[PDB]
Amino acid sequence: LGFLGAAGSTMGVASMTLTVQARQLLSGIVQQQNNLLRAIEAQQHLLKLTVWGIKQLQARVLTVERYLRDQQLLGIWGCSGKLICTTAVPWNASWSNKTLDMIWNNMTWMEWEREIDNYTGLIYTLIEESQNQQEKNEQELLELDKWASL
Amino acid sequence: EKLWVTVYYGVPVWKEATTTLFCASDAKAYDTEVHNVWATHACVPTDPNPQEVVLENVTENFNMWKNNMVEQMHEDIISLWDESLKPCVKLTPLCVTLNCTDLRNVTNINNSSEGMRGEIKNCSFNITTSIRDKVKKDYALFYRLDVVPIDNDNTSYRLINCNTSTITQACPKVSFEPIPIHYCTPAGFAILKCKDKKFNGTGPCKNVSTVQCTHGIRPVVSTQLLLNGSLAEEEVVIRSSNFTDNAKNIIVQLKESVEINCTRPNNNTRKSIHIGPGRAFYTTGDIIGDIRQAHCNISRTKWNNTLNQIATKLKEQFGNNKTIVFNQSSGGDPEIVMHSFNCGGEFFYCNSTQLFNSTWNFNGTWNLTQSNGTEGNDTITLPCRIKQIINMWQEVGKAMYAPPIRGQIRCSSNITGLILTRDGGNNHNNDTETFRPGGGDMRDNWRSELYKYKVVKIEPLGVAPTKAKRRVVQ
Amino acid sequence: FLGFLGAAGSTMGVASMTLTVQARQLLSGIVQQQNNLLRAIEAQQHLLKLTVWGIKQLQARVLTVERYLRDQQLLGIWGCSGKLICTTAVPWNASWSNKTLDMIWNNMTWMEWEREIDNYTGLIYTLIEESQNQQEKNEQELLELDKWASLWNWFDITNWLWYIKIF
Amino acid sequence: FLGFLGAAGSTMGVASMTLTVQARQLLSGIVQQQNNLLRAIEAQQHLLKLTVWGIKQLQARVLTVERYLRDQQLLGIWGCSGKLICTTAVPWNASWSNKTLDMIWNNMTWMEWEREIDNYTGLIYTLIEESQNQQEKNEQELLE
Amino acid sequence: KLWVTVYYGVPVWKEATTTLFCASDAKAYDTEVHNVWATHACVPTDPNPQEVVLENVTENFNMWKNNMVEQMHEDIISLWDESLKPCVKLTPLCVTLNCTDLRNVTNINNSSEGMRGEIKNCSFNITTSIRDKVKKDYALFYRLDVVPIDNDNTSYRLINCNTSTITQACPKVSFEPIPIHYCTPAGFAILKCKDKKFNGTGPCKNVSTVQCTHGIRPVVSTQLLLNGSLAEEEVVIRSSNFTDNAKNIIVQLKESVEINCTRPNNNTRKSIHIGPGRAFYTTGDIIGDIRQAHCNISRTKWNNTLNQIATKLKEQFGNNKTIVFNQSSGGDPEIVMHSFNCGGEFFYCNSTQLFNSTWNFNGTWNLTQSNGTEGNDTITLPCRIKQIINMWQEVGKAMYAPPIRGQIRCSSNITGLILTRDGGNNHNNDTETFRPGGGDMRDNWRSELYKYKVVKIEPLGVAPTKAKRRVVQ
Amino acid sequence: KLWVTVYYGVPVWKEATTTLFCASDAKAYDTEVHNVWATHACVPTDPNPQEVVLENVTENFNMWKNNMVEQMHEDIISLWDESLKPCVKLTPLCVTLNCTDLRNVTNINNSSEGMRGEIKNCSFNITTSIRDKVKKDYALFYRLDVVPIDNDNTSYRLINCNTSTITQACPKVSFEPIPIHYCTPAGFAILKCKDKKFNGTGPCKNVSTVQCTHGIRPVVSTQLLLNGSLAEEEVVIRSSNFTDNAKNIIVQLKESVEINCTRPNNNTRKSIHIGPGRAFYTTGDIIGDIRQAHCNISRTKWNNTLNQIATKLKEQFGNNKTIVFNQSSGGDPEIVMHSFNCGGEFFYCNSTQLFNSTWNFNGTWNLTQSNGTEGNDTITLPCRIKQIINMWQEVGKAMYAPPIRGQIRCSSNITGLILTRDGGNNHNNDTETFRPGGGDMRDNWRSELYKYKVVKIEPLGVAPTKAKRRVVQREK
Ligand SMILES: *[C@@H]1O[C@H](CO)[C@@H](O[C@@H]2O[C@H](CO)[C@@H](O[C@@H]3O[C@H](CO[C@H]4O[C@H](CO[C@H]5O[C@H](CO)[C@@H](O)[C@H](O)[C@@H]5O)[C@@H](O)[C@H](O)[C@@H]4O)[C@@H](O)[C@H](O[C@H]4O[C@H](CO)[C@@H](O)[C@H](O)[C@@H]4O[C@H]4O[C@H](CO)[C@@H](O)[C@H](O)[C@@H]4O)[C@@H]3O)[C@H](O)[C@H]2NC(C)=O)[C@H](O)[C@H]1NC(C)=O
Ligand SMILES: *[C@@H]1O[C@H](CO)[C@@H](O[C@@H]2O[C@H](CO)[C@@H](O)[C@H](O)[C@H]2NC(C)=O)[C@H](O)[C@H]1NC(C)=O
Ligand SMILES: *[C@@H]1O[C@H](CO)[C@@H](O[C@@H]2O[C@H](CO)[C@@H](O)[C@H](O)[C@H]2NC(C)=O)[C@H](O)[C@H]1NC(C)=O
Ligand SMILES: *[C@@H]1O[C@H](CO)[C@@H](O)[C@H](O)[C@H]1NC(C)=O
């Protein structure tokens, strides 16, 4: 499988259904596809840099980077725990000037990002990452003096 | 009324992107261990069940002329071909004056000017093999197309492109048999399939699905007619970048398969002369039996109707009140002037005039016609001349010699598409539209199968405002 | 890798002593160490260039990476990317095995165990992540707001009280 | 505010609040972030048939991928995989430098402090490795 | 009591050696013409490079001990290797070359004015693709491309023949140096000494970082640095050991000196086919009078330029010094005569005038202007063409350059000088002599890479803190 | 109830096929001028390798189904391809060779010497870089590398010139085997069967595991095994199917038999430039008189060793059968004559003396000691020299060895033998006829990887436990 689909479904429908199940399946296929190729890599062992060989090699690297760079952001954003993570950054009117329903009932996830695109380059790139440092550094400052037991 | 960003991993959002696709062919070829195909040898296996999803409520824009896949596929098959003939003997030493005496069969009074007079020439030559101190006189039953008169002498001919290019003989063991190749996107990438029953090749495609792997796109390279390809659905579809422009080729996709029975009805014996240390040049020894002309059988009625269909679609595309002329290719490369393809490892330059000659008239009897007698329909036989020396389509410096396939050759290809070219030619008082069989540009052949595919990347990271807040600080 | 699995696979129990917790981290640690050694080499010789061996090491490096990635990815799917040994909420359908815990551990060795589960493997793994997701979404909505509780959490419960004195 | 290495001359404390800036560009690379090229090439096309540069770009990528992975593996061995700033139970042996926190975080910059702790790096890392082992023991008996 | 606190993302860097990749501008690929540097392979240059300034930071650079120099050295020579790898080998071409003094039998065009002997119209019987066919063919070789043989007045041969192969350069591949931007892989960085006058070694007052080098044109030139970067309001002189002799002296100029160079001869191309699919390109004939190649140089501009360098050299070797300029003593034409490439054509120019200048220590200060233009008294440099070019270091592996159709024109900017202080054994009380140098691709790379150094970034960091795990589950 | 618990790091492996990277000690890496089997690429081995003994572990090791032997073979073949790829080729030399003046004189040179004109001052009208000018040169060529042409008593050529391209090996490249440690990548492991003796297949009592294989020299030899490994306690015989006659019989000696081999001649190393930057390396003159190459075998030690394997051979086909060590049946010289490479020069040594003895167990004997240590203890092997090595797998791709200057001396360690049983009446005649064999490199690598089996380590595991994920068991 490995196909989220439901792209046409309203972002809210996608933010309510297939908001974790299909996404779990998507990642569950990424490792399978990999496992499958690995199973053959052992059988064929024709990893020789041929015309297709180099293609397979480039493809392998491309996928590795794709997964990591995504996980990297999540980890910095303190969202490595799971697919859906709530943050403490409030949404600036500049970013979007709509209502929760306007974005969930009258917007598709693709269309939604299309508008935020410009603002998104800062929403998570700077504000979200900065939020983590405050929390991280605070956690340390909090653990510096701690007594509360149960 | 307070919204806080909530990062969602797995959002169904994607972006148009170009990438390095990987081949995925049926493992049966690997098990057969033939590894003679110019590709598929290291190509990975194909997911037994193709994995596709119907993206309903999605109207992605599709453009054939802007499909990177086509450009990639082109370089791939080119590189695959170059790699296959990379470690094979070259005919650079065979570049000598060839005493092309008419073949004894050609002289034979039995075939009194019946046909094929000089088509197969018995050319003799002096060669220098591994022994650089001793020369050797050898004979090779070459073809007429491969040789070119040099001294205007009776039997003075030479291998075509002897100096213009480096003739490299493809290793005889290798097999030129296109087997379903499935181009697959690395993860995080997807191929979008224009599922529309009829698509203009450019513009928004409504009915739309996707695949992680292309369908078995056989890398069959054929000029004019498109054999063994994807059939059009219900309606013949004509696709062009600028229909108004004449320079651009016109890709016609047939809805029905015009099965073509091509054969080489000559029992042949392969001869091999050692030329260079451990390097053997393979040629023909003797033609066993009367020399007969290679031909292809096409049902006139079945094709006549085929043309009737393409003519109507062409009339709708242009002026329905216009005379349509299916003239023959007005000169050009031998590949373009005559339908060309490789059946059973031999390239058959077959005449396609009979197929593209009849000119339809508007305001006439378009009543589809049907056969009334077996002899009446018979078959459209094509005078075919086998050219072994094949130069690169878009490169002149590189030419590839073809090893003779000994024995009878025969194929059953299916005509699935046709390349055409509009040529207004200052039609007297317009009212006339001429069309000639187009060809060349390997990309044209690949476009007929990637017409629906569109590679896009995937971004499973999306931030959205949510009344919920991390609220982890407190 | 020096102490790579220093202790061999004994009864899953004896193997699951302090040995598993230590040997596993030690293996992961020394695996990281020898990998770091190879990079110290490449950072110096800088000769690895499409040679019979150069292609070998390059492909090997890629393999190790995707091999590690596949394992971690799985841990992620079923929300176990943190602790090496993570419990699940998936019950053992008797179909998977009738053996008692003692048979499973104080006798079965990880090597022969996976054999009698080879048919179940791909099934079980799918149940692990499936259950993880089922509760995950519910949990996401379960604690979605609860801002009221958070107030009492530092109003009454005083998550971070500053009243730290004696007597 | 500060650039990629903007807190290079800043004291350990000030730089501590800018850690993410560097962490964000550890894997993010020009060649990598390019994705689809405006060139006819597609993700380095076919490495241009292993060009002199084709292989270097290829090699460069693996090093970014393996290096980030090594880094992660380490924090993972130390447990705090996802976390950025962790808190070990390893007591700070004064042998590794006897300095007050004020000097360390309000005077010494990370670049300068690292030189002092350079010799005592592997020792410390293993001490964390075995501390997590002790932690795991405590957790196992707690679950029991 | 404190506890180790793992800090991920610490701003700490350490000197490292790693592979680098080129990022040429998109416009370079947009040319749609293959460049010997294969700029097409280079990744698209990021529109705006990010020059983060490292404030409160000082770093020790080693222009002479920078891996990147050695790396780029290998990269450039490998680039050329693969560029001419699949080109005609001109192997069979070498035979016996019977030659004439000029392509003009008499003063057909300008035999009197034309440099008699340079053309050396050599004719030869070469075999085409057809093995049984031999053809007499003629070609033009500058004296620098033919060696007299058999003592016969008319019998000659290719210069680097007998010795090594002389593969012709693939004609389509052009040789226009396109600025490349060596970029560090993620987790690595390049540090740029923003300090104005840097000796190439030692600490840096101002230091910045770039993930990508500034565009560097891979121009190879001798006794000069063409189209190079410019110093900052002060000519700078760098050498690992100034008190040594063999050490070549690098000089980066603060002011660019324009050098107009051209081949004033209209040429035609003749594709002599030598072997199947192998065509040797050669000059058919010069259309019009023959004029030797030259270069124009503003006496006054070069004057002031040397003046600035001379002073810097007295500052380097004791105030009181009569810095005297002299021409290369002897050796390979490469390092004896100033040579460079111009529009796909190598030029060996006799910069005799540029170094025919012995200066004392008094009255030399006055910076004379150009009151009397006199056509700028432009210095005209006698320039010739050596078609075959030997590998700078490798004895074997020579290469031929196919002729370009038509008059070639060039206008590079002088941006640097390579010098060799000769030991003051005697007669050198104050006559400090600096003969032109060169002969080493590395010396050119050091001049442009002095301000850069590559450091691995280690994001892992430890620190003591009163905080404790406090993890009791 | 029983909730499955995921355990990471479970000790589980699975027979797998993985790309292996060579790891050399990098001791001679500093000597870059020295080039041997791409040592420069081989990454320096771990300074302190550790072999974790697998206690209470038993594993099967099918040597004839090992993947390592296959990988070594492919890599070693490609290594030679890479070495000869940028080197010169003798396509022009394949000219009619007027071979005469076999020896300056047949006096002291051939008075009793068995040279009998093995070398020849062959002359030939070959061209050079000048192309136009053609010059005739003379070069001493071994009768082994030369083949007579026509009925002419002086027209000759190179054994493989007409049917195979000869590529001149680059002289700067050394040909001395180095300890190459085939190391497996992380996530994979090499099991090591430590049983004192092994049938070469079936379960293994003592089993261990190592991250890299022990140092294995890429030695290619025939009818013998040089600088190899030794068996444990006693000799071990190994075959896919011993009772089958075709299957080659692999033998591993428990004791090392020193073989002193040397070319006792001072050779001038002449060089002939043929083409631009293409110099053919040959021999100008043999300084002094010409002496044939020879190898020294301890007559007593070899008897004892042959008796040892003979006993094992009885233990394999019944004491009733007599052991008959006969000479090589016939075929290509590579196999007919024990042929190895000493000091970058390939030597062909007659092995009839080492394979000419009917042990006949019914004959009673114990061990043979050497009372006469001085003399009569050197089975001198008549060794001939060859420079044109035919490829072992393909007719083409022949290779020329540029002559070495001075005396070429070596002292390898015999460590086993490759044999061939001959099914026939001889066996019915109460006799096992074993003849030496070779020509299949796979056997050489099998003799060193015999105790190795690459397996992939899958840290992933599942296990029912009475513990549930309490992350779902949250509260207010
Ligand atoms: C491959 O496909 C082709 C295409 O279908 C098949 O061949 C087709 O066969 C058709 C007949 O079955 C034939 O149609 C006849 O065309 C003749 C000439 O066509 C032109 O002219 C007519 C009339 O226009 C006239 O008037 C205008 C002004 O209004 C003038 O400007 C013109 O100059 C003319 O003077 C047009 O209609 C056409 O479109 C063309 O412009 C006609 O003569 C013919 O009419 C009848 O007479 C024929 C004898 O003269 C007779 O053979 C034909 O059958 C017609 O018979 C009529 O009467 C009978 C009895 O009442 C009735 O049953 C018929 O139905 C009909 O009414 C036709 O119009 C196509 O021209 C022809 N096309 C080609 C390209 O050859 C071919 O068979 C097929 N092959 C296979 C193997 O399948
Ligand atoms: C979101 O913000 C935009 C920008 O202010 C609003 O669009 C403006 O609407 C007003 C009032 O009619 C106009 O005068 C402007 O010309 C609009 N500006 C732009 C940029 O479009 C929009 O109405 C807001 N949406 C809501 C419902 O809050
Ligand atoms: C090649 O053969 C043809 C046919 O025999 C020659 O053409 C003939 O030439 C003779 C003498 O000029 C004429 O009398 C005949 O009438 C010609 N016949 C034809 C059919 O043209 C030709 O001359 C020969 N030589 C060449 C040019 O190859
Ligand atoms: C060998 O054959 C003989 C036949 O006489 C038999 O007696 C003996 O047992 C067989 N095996 C041994 C152990 O020699």
Q: Which amino acid is at F151?
A: N
Q: How many CB atoms lie within 10 A of CB E163?
A: 16
Could you tell me if residue E119 is inside a domain?
A: no
Burial readout E27-42 (b: 16 or more C-beta within 10 A, e: otherwise): ebbeeeeebbbbbbbb
Q: Which two tokens stand for residue F232?
A: 């444990």
Cβ–Cβ under 8 Å, residues B407 and B267: yes
Q: Which of helix, strand or coil describes residue B332?
A: coil
Could you tell me if residue F39 is inside a domain?
A: yes
Burial class (CB in 10 A: 0-12, 13-18, 19+), C148: exposed
Question: Shortest CA distance to E365 belongs to which of E280, E308, E446?
Answer: E308
Phi, psi of A84, rounded to the nearest 5 degrees: -100, 125
Q: Which two tokens stand for residue D82?
A: 């996802």
Query: Domains in chain D: how many in total?
Result: 1
Q: How far is the CA of B323 from the centre of ligand 1 (A)?
A: 15
Q: Which two tokens stand for residue B398?
A: 């590189």
In angstroms, the CA F18 to CA F454 distance is 8
Sort strands F338-342 and F345-349 into parallel, antiparallel or unpaired.
Answer: antiparallel
DSSP state of F106: S
List the Cα angle F42/F43/F45 in 5-degree steps.
Answer: 110
Chain F residue at shortest CA distance from B276:
F162
Question: Shortest CA distance to E335 belongs to which of E189, E442, E435?
Answer: E435
Burial readout B260-285 (b: 16 or more C-beta within 10 A, e: otherwise): bebbbebebeebebbbbbbbebbbbe
In angstroms, the CA B461 to CA B11 distance is 6
User: Could you tell me what percentage of chain D is helix, strand and coil, using 3-state DSSP and rounding each to the nearest 5?
Assistant: 55, 0, 40
In the numeric block, the tokens 């043309």 are attached to: B307
Burial readout E205-236 (b: 16 or more C-beta within 10 A, e: otherwise): eebbbbbbbbbbbbbbbbbbbbbbbebeeebb
Could you tell me if residue D1 is inside a domain?
A: no
Cβ C43–E19 below 8 Å, yes or no? no
Cβ–Cβ under 8 Å, residues B449 and B217: yes
In angstroms, the CA B14 to CA B24 distance is 24
Q: Which two tokens stand for residue D127?
A: 């001490």
Cβ–Cβ under 8 Å, residues E435 and E248: no
* Nearest-10 crossing angle of helices C52-77, C118-142: 50
Which subunits sit against A, judged by 3+ Cβ pairs under 8 A?
A: B, C, D, E, F
- Mutation site, B21, B75, B83, interface D, largest D CB count within 10 A: B75
Alpha-carbon distances, residue C6 vs A148, E259, F50 (angstroms): 41, 72, 10
Q: Is the CB of B154 inside a 6 Å radius of any atom of ligand 3?
A: yes
Q: Is the CB of B301 inside a 6 Å radius of any atom of ligand 1?
A: yes
Cβ–Cβ under 8 Å, residues F466 and C85: no
Alpha-carbon distances, residue B201 vs A7, B212, B309, E23 (angstroms): 23, 21, 19, 35
Q: What is the largest CA-CA distance in chain D?
A: 61
Question: Shortest CA distance to B260 belongs to which of B305, B307, B226, B304?
Answer: B226
Alpha-carbon distances, residue B70 vs B44, B186, F233 (angstroms): 20, 17, 66
Same domain, B108 and B188: no
Q: Is the CB of B153 inside a 6 Å radius of any atom of ligand 3?
A: yes
List the Cα angle C135/C140/C142 in 5-degree steps.
Answer: 85
In angstroms, the CA F68 to CA F66 distance is 6
Resolution (A): 3.4
* Nearest-10 crossing angle of helices A51-76, C52-77: 40
Q: How many CB atoms lie within 10 A of CB A138?
A: 12
Q: How far is the CA of F312 from the centre of ligand 4 (A)?
A: 16
List the Cα angle A35/A41/A47 in 5-degree steps.
Answer: 135
- The shortest CB-CB distance from F276 to any of E95, E96, E164 is to E164
Q: How far is the CA of A98 from the centre of ligand 2 (A)?
A: 10
List the Cα angle F152/F158/F163 in 5-degree steps.
Answer: 110
In angstroms, the CA B422 to CA D2 distance is 62
In angstroms, the CA F197 to CA F182 distance is 23
In angstroms, the CA B44 to CA F127 distance is 50
Q: Which two tokens stand for residue E352?
A: 């005799």
Sort strands B384-386 and B390-391 into parallel, antiparallel or unpaired.
Answer: unpaired
- Sort out which chain F residues have CB atoms less than 8 A from B129's CB and list them: 162
* Partners of residue F5 on adjacent β-strands: C87
Q: Which two tokens stand for residue D79?
A: 């447990």
* Partners of residue D11 on adjacent β-strands: D109
Give pairs for A112-120: CB < 8 Å, separation 24+. A112/A11, A112/B462, A112/B464, A113/B11, A113/B13, A113/B459, A113/B462, A116/B463, A119/A92, A119/A94, A119/A95, A120/A95, A120/B463
Cβ–Cβ under 8 Å, residues B361 and B469: no
Domain boundaries, position E280: 3-87+173-460
CA nearest ligand 1 atom 72, residue: B365
DSSP state of C96: G
Q: Which of helix, strand or coil describes residue F412?
A: strand
* Partners of residue E35 on adjacent β-strands: E174
Q: Which two tokens stand for residue F404?
A: 């070495």
In angstroms, the CA A144 to CA C87 distance is 31
Q: Which amino acid is at B309?
A: Q
In angstroms, the CA F128 to CA E161 distance is 11
Q: Which two tokens stand for residue F263?
A: 């070319």
Could you tell me if residue B250 is inside a domain?
A: yes
Helix H segments across E317-356?
A: 333-336, 352-355
Cβ A73–B19 below 8 Å, yes or no? no
Q: Which two tokens stand for residue C65?
A: 């990476």
- Sort out which chain B residues have CB atoms less than 8 A from D61's CB and list them: none
Give pairs for E279-285: CB < 8 Å, separation 24+. E279/E88, E280/E88, E280/E90, E280/E93, E280/E168, E281/E168, E281/E171, E281/E402, E281/E403, E282/E139, E282/E140, E282/E402, E282/E403, E283/E139, E283/E140, E283/E403, E285/E103, E285/E140
- The full 3-state SS of D19-52, as one line of letters, equals HHHHHHCCCCCHHHHHCCCCCCCCCCCCHHHHCH
Cβ–Cβ under 8 Å, residues F276 and F129: yes
Phi, psi of E215, rounded to the nearest 5 degrees: -55, 125
Burial class (CB in 10 A: 0-12, 13-18, 19+), B406: middle
DSSP state of F283: -
* Partners of residue F260 on adjacent β-strands: F296, F411
In angstroms, the CA B177 to CA C164 distance is 83
Sort strands B98-102 and B61-63 into parallel, antiparallel or unpaired.
Answer: unpaired
Q: Give the CATH number of the domain where residue E364 resides.
A: 2.170.40.20
Question: Shortest CA distance to F35 belongs to which of F165, F184, F169?
Answer: F169
Burial readout F171-197 (b: 16 or more C-beta within 10 A, e: otherwise): bebbbbbbbbbbbbbbbbbbbbbbbee
Could you tell me if residue C94 is inside a domain?
A: yes
Sort strands B189-194 and B455-458 into parallel, antiparallel or unpaired.
Answer: antiparallel
Sort strands E166-168 and E398-400 into parallel, antiparallel or unpaired.
Answer: parallel
Could you tell me if residue B93 is inside a domain?
A: no
Q: Which amino acid is at D107?
A: N
Question: Shortest CA distance to A133 belongs to which of D88, B9, D21, E457?
Answer: D21
Q: How many CB atoms lie within 10 A of CB B246?
A: 15
Q: Which amino acid is at F93?
A: L
Ligand that comes closest to the CA of residue B365 = 1
Alpha-carbon distances, residue E419 vs E229, E251, E323 (angstroms): 18, 8, 13
Identify the H or E element spanning C142.
Answer: helix C118-142
Burial class (CB in 10 A: 0-12, 13-18, 19+), F344: middle
Same domain, B123 and B68: no
- Sign of the Cα torsion D112, D116, D117, D119 reads positive
In angstroms, the CA B92 to CA B414 distance is 37
Cβ–Cβ under 8 Å, residues F409 and F343: yes
Cβ–Cβ under 8 Å, residues E413 and E253: no
Question: Shortest CA distance to E23 belongs to which of E202, E178, E250, E243?
Answer: E178
Cβ F129–E163 below 8 Å, yes or no? yes
In the numeric block, the tokens 């190393």 are attached to: F269
Cβ A43–F17 below 8 Å, yes or no? yes
Cβ–Cβ under 8 Å, residues E256 and E304: no
Q: How many CB atoms lie within 10 A of CB E267?
A: 20
- The full 3-state SS of E47-112, as one line of letters, equals CCCCCEEECCCCCCEEHHHCHHHHHHHHHHHHHHHHHHCCCCCCCCCCCCEEEECCCCCCCCCCCC
Q: What is the largest CA-CA distance in chain F?
A: 112
* Partners of residue B194 on adjacent β-strands: B208
In angstroms, the CA C89 to CA F467 distance is 9
In angstroms, the CA B435 to CA E42 distance is 44
Could you tell me if residue B471 is inside a domain?
A: no
Question: Shortest CA distance to E343 belongs to which of E265, E398, E399?
Answer: E265
Strands (E), F282-366: 286-287, 293-296, 322-325, 338-342, 345-349, 357-358
CA nearest ligand 4 atom 1, residue: F320
Helix H segments across chain A?
A: 11-16, 21-44, 51-76, 100-104, 109-122, 129-144
- E124: Cβ–Cβ under 8 A, 6 or more apart, which residues? E93, E95, E96, E97, E98, E136, E137, E138, E139
In angstroms, the CA F165 to CA F167 distance is 6
Q: How many CB atoms lie within 10 A of CB E457?
A: 23
In angstroms, the CA F358 to CA F101 distance is 44
- C103: Cβ–Cβ under 8 A, 6 or more apart, which residues? none
Same domain, B183 and B149: no
Cβ D133–C35 below 8 Å, yes or no? no
Q: Which two tokens stand for residue E197?
A: 């006058």
